[PDB]
Design a protein around this nucleic acid. Sequence first.
DNA 1: TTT
Lengths: 418, 399
Amino acid sequence: ATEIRASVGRMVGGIGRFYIQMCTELKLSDQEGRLIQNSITIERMVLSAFDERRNRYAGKDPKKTGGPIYRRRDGKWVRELILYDKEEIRRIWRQANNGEDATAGLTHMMIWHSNLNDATYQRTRALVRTGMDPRMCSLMQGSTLPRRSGAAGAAIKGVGTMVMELIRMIKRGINDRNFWRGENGRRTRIAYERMCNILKGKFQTAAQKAMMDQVRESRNPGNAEIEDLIFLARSALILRGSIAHKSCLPACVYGLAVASGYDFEREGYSLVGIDPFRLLQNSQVFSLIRPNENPAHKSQLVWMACHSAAFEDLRVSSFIRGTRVIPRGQLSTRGVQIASNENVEAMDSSTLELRSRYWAITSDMRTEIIRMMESARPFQGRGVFELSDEKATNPIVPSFDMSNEGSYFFGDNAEEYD
Amino acid sequence: TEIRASVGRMVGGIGRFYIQMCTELKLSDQEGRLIQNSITIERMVLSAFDERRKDPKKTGGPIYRRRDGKWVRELILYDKEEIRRIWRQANNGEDATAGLTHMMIWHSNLNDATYQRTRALVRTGMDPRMCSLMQGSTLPRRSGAAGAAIKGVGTMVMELIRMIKRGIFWNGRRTRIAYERMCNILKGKFQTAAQKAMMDQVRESRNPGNAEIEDLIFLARSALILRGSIAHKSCLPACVYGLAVASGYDFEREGYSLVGIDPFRLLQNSQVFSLIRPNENPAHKSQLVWMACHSAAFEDLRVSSFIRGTRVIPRGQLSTRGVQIASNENVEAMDSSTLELRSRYWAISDMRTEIIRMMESARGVFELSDEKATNPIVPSFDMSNEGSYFFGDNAEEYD
DNA sequence: TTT
């Protein structure tokens, strides 16, 4: 049902309209409004404004949000801090979404933040702290997503992310008996069970799924379940999970699309085919560049975040991109966000290069999972099409430098997420 | 400046050798940053110039390569003669023996940070507490003056006790001056007249036996409170000098020193990978190598922690075994990690009685941006942490 | 998720 394209069209058109309104409201020039650091501050503000936790009770007004906005003053970039009532941001978001809930658009910006974090930060320390292997880095899609992300969030979380969450719950349960006991212990028990079914949904073999059934129905979850969850994570390195992959773009790309009269509602939109590639092909996004950062390396980071491509084979990504997509360890860039202590007056901006050449579309079960792992074969470039091939009629034959590393995480030196 | 010039030329030569061996073995730049590869290359040039002390004309060991997204072990074999040639050609015809001994001291510092010697100590009639006095205890027999300079009191005492015991032998004129020089080297390391006098007495017994061992044990015990003066040399794996020279760094012109900011600058911009065994903590492997690089096994952990800016923990609490992978180990199962090698800061019977009286009476850190050492940072230590790397020790015994 |  083309109704799905209709609904997704309306979500991203809402984000666009919101972004245009926030730019007029903050008196951003159209140049400043194409700065990805501005997009991320505005996206963080609408997300905080709708984060109903609050704890109205040190010196930080809980009714207020904001952050850094970067403006051209006298031929250089300057940091100006802003402060906004959450209430007015909510009003601007509802007014752009014509009074609807528009929670889908919020979760969409969240999945964009999660995909950018996956492309930017290392989680090997979080893995070691949990008794997981560093090799499980390739299984950590969505590992920085909040609780509040619902079904779209859960859909993109990798096996490692789910296993890390279940191990963190088991350990609190080991730590205190009265974690599992009475009224509130009843609560965390179904949260535990749901988390098991979400991870069960991701496994594609009956053996792996059965093992999760066993993990879900232990009355005293402890080390034996952690050990079984570690075994399952290791198996997911060869008998791979089914993980949803959603290309979500910064609000400033949807904003520039709606300002140019693009009608997302009528054309529809999809996070899965040509649609994000078409928008990125005609995009004009600027980024602040630190001194001695390579802007082509910053471009790779953002292209990768936008196409949710951190966990994809680099040779496949290279082919679709039409320029080499290199391991993170070889990038001369740090992340998009500028820290508070950084000097932005020393920083130039570059147009990000976001185009592509192509677009694209317990012991029994242990034994059986080992047999399958040994039997497994040791391309992924299938549904690649020309941008002129709107209907996917002419699959392009993949062309790889097969001697390049497949994993984005080979030789990784990225900052640890914190 | 001519000291810096000569040290610059040694380190630049090691770099040039490493770059040549990487082209020779068709190592990619990624493979060449693997510390296991560096150790195989360093072991090969050291064996090729004789034990440091199967077909004896040939040397080799494991080289690890990326094939189909995994690490694979390839055993290699080279005529010693061609390795010697490649070393000399990298050191511009000279027989750069300083550079050989430099790689040796790096191996010795790594062993000191990795392996227990408490069994070797007990076998010699020494105390396990003397673990903290065993710098250089794995150094090859005669490593010349740089070797002898970094050997701790315990190491010298263990060597002298081993000689006395063989004599319980005195060709006999030979071993007598070897004995005498070993006594003067150990005398050099003691910082009190009483301790030094006692060594003079030990050097001039015509029949060295149990009484000299007993005096050597007494002196080792005293070195736990009236500490010796020991050289500490920060020597890095060849792959770090190699990566520095490939980036056009000119060690000869800039000079180099093993003592101030120079090794810290190199480590701060380094990219060294290590094979990690399953269930090993990569941050623990990083501590091991950071410690080996800064010759810091015998330093107070609270000093090490301060300079490092992250806690440097006792060996007994580390979840790693050593850097070298044994022959029977499965490398295809192993990932590699970037070693974390950065720092927050950089840094610069009468006699018996009198040694007892003294024993009873006993009670430069700079920013890496502070190139000239102008602004000493006042240290702040967690005094409730243990000071000794060897507290709670469980490391494998050296063999 | 306002320095």
